[PDB]
Amino acid sequence: GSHMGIQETDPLTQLSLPPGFRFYPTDEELMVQYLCRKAAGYDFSLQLIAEIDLYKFDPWVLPNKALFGEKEWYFFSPRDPNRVAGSGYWKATGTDKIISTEGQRVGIKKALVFYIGKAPKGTKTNWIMHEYRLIEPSDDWVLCRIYKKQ
Amino acid sequence: GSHMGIQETDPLPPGFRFYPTDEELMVQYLCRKAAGYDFSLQLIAEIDLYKFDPWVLPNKALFGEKEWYFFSPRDRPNRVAGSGYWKATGTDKIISTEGQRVGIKKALVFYIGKAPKGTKTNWIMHEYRLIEPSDDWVLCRIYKKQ
């Protein structure tokens, strides 16, 4: 019959961002305003970062699965060494950092790098992940920044 | 007499900050204002920048943690402001959009005292202006180096 298109919801234009505004959150904002608030059901935290299983994908596919982003993308992924994803694996690298708010430790930031192939014979790529997790015992997510170096 | 007050202003998720490109500042801010367009909110306030010491300017700006933006009247060398003067520095850049030149960006630095015997400070201004032939504003970024 007559055509009925699908109307997709741009989650930024609902917020009416003036031009020039970009999402450059501090580590403390990602923990307190996004990760902690997601558990609390806060609107902007639910609607601005996509729930996704990161380990089902090759990282170069991920930019298209993010609700927004130009050189960095953010996701919530289910909280769980060389863990497999797509045609490769993510390897922990560098030094884990503790994130604090108002003198309380709230989160840990972990860096990882994507290798293509099968551990431990894979080759390093420029895809980086920053996995932010809450300090809390055993719904349950980590917050991840994905980007490509260089 | 019952009390009659005055309402100064009338009413962002976390992590959102103002990081405009040179092209956005020219097209989306300066050009729109020159064209007499309305804005959803006042973000970049009108001010006479040359009435002030740069270190009080963060207080007059509606937003910004380390950079502040203003619209200031377009002037029709070492121009005086407060206890000092702004000196042009570096290389003026041309801003283009879709292959058209639309603006010039000019860097300046604040010196305290009386020209030409002042002392350099870390206060920087970037003055963006519309290109034109030989409602009149410049748009200025203010920040402190280091």
Side-chain angles (χ1 to χ4, degrees):
Chain A
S2 112
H3 172 49
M4 289 181 204
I6 276 162
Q7 189 138 300
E8 298 169 89
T9 286
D10 183 333
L12 295 184
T13 66
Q14 13 145 122
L15 303 169
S16 288
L17 279 184
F21 279 88
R22 285 169 164 82
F23 190 56
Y24 282 112
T26 60
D27 287 348
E28 175 180 22
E29 293 163 344
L30 284 175
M31 294 296 319
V32 174
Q33 304 298 323
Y34 290 87
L35 200 43
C36 278
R37 308 280 237 233
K38 173 170 184 74
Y42 279 91
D43 176 2
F44 67 86
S45 322
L46 260 41
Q47 260 58 256
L48 286 178
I49 302 186
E51 281 174 17
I52 184 162
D53 190 354
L54 276 166
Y55 291 82
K56 276 198 190 3
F57 302 102
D58 296 299
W60 48 89
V61 184
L62 282 164
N64 283 335
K65 308 220 175 207
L67 303 177
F68 65 96
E70 293 184 277
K71 308 196 208 91
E72 314 206 315
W73 304 273
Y74 297 82
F75 307 93
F76 287 116
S77 192
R79 186 142 176 194
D80 185 59
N82 307 328
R83 205 188 147 176
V84 173
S87 66
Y89 60 90
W90 286 102
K91 184 176 257 304
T93 184
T95 300
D96 291 358
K97 189 196 154 210
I98 302 276
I99 314 308
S100 285
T101 187
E102 303 184 347
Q104 306 315 300
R105 295 175 306 212
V106 279
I108 302 166
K109 180 188 151 198
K110 171 169 167 208
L112 311 93
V113 174
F114 191 73
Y115 286 73
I116 287 168
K118 174 183 124 178
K121 297 226 187 300
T123 55
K124 188 175 185 131
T125 69
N126 291 138
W127 292 96
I128 308 301
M129 180 187 315
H130 291 174
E131 176 194 278
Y132 295 77
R133 68 183 193 262
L134 294 163
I135 306 189
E136 61 189 19
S138 354
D139 222 12
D140 197 20
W141 306 87
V142 285
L143 179 32
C144 295
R145 163 188 304 116
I146 301 287
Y147 71 100
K148 197 186 193 211
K149 224 177 120 151
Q150 176 225 137
Chain B
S2 138
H3 168 51
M4 304 280 232
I6 277 151
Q7 203 168 50
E8 289 151 281
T9 354
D10 52 276
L12 298 162
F16 282 98
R17 294 166 161 76
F18 195 55
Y19 284 116
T21 55
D22 285 349
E23 173 171 5
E24 291 169 345
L25 282 177
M26 293 301 312
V27 175
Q28 302 295 314
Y29 291 90
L30 200 45
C31 300
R32 292 288 280 177
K33 177 160 188 90
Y37 280 94
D38 196 18
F39 294 81
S40 263
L41 324 155
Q42 213 195 26
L43 307 148
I44 308 194
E46 296 180 2
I47 196 173
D48 190 356
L49 297 162
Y50 291 83
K51 309 258 134 103
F52 302 102
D53 296 296
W55 50 90
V56 301
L57 289 176
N59 302 318
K60 326 217 149 269
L62 316 181
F63 71 90
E65 283 169 73
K66 308 197 207 92
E67 316 202 317
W68 306 273
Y69 298 76
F70 307 91
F71 285 118
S72 198
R74 184 142 176 195
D75 183 60
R76 298 307 199 175
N78 303 336
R79 205 187 146 179
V80 173
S83 67
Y85 59 93
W86 286 103
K87 186 174 259 308
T89 185
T91 298
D92 292 357
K93 188 197 156 209
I94 303 277
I95 314 311
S96 288
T97 184
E98 303 181 347
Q100 305 314 294
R101 297 176 306 214
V102 280
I104 302 165
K105 179 184 156 191
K106 169 171 169 214
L108 311 94
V109 174
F110 193 76
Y111 286 71
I112 288 168
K114 176 182 121 180
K117 295 225 186 300
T119 54
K120 190 173 183 134
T121 67
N122 292 137
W123 290 97
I124 309 299
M125 179 186 319
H126 291 177
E127 176 197 280
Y128 295 78
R129 69 181 192 264
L130 293 162
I131 298 247
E132 62 170 37
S134 14
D135 220 284
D136 202 29
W137 305 93
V138 286
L139 170 35
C140 298
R141 164 189 302 112
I142 303 289
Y143 71 99
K144 196 188 194 211
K145 226 178 118 150
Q146 148 115 154

